Design a protein around this nucleic acid. Structure first.
Ligand code: BA
Ligand code: BA
Length: 95
RNA sequence: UGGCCGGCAUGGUCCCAGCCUCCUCGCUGGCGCCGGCUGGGCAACACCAUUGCACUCCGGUGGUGAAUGGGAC
């Protein structure tokens, strides 16, 4: 069953050969236009590699970003996007 | 040589260039032949495995089984 709208968009199918720092930067390069970004979390661990959590301030930003960038060719791969299952702490720490 | 040893071979010291490397990337490192013993680390790099929902850093294996010429005394 799909996920409900969230402040954070979960992206996967990312190019696993990109260093964390760079990846966080690049992502910001293409997602910033959708709205303020509280943070982007990336990990290259066995379980978390190839995915990312972009955390937008306003749910609409994520939503917009979701519908707009779905399937976007990034580092030679089609970016897959969804809403995160739950709220990232940064967001909890408020609403 | 990342630590360690054994065989053999080989006049010496400099100078310039080239080249090499997971473990002090460069001019007060190294760049004959052969065999065996062993430590560290995934930091980089490669390869294998992975499509994975986090907010705790964290899969595995591999490399040195490396690299030549010239010139001054
Ligand atoms: Ba060396
Ligand atoms: Ba690794």
């Amino acid at each position: 069953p799909e996920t409900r709208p969230n402040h954070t968009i979960y992206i996967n199918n990312l190019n696993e050969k990109i260093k964390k720092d760079e990846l966080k930067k690049s992502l910001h390069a293409i997602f910033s236009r959708f709205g303020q970004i509280l943070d982007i979390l990336v990990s290259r661990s066995l379980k978390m590699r190839g995915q990312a959590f972009v955390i937008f301030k306003e749910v609409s930003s994520a939503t917009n970003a979701l519908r707009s960038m779905q399937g976007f060719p990034f580092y030679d791969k089609p970016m897959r996007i969804q809403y995160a299952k739950t709220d990232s702490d940064i967001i909890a720490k408020m609403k």
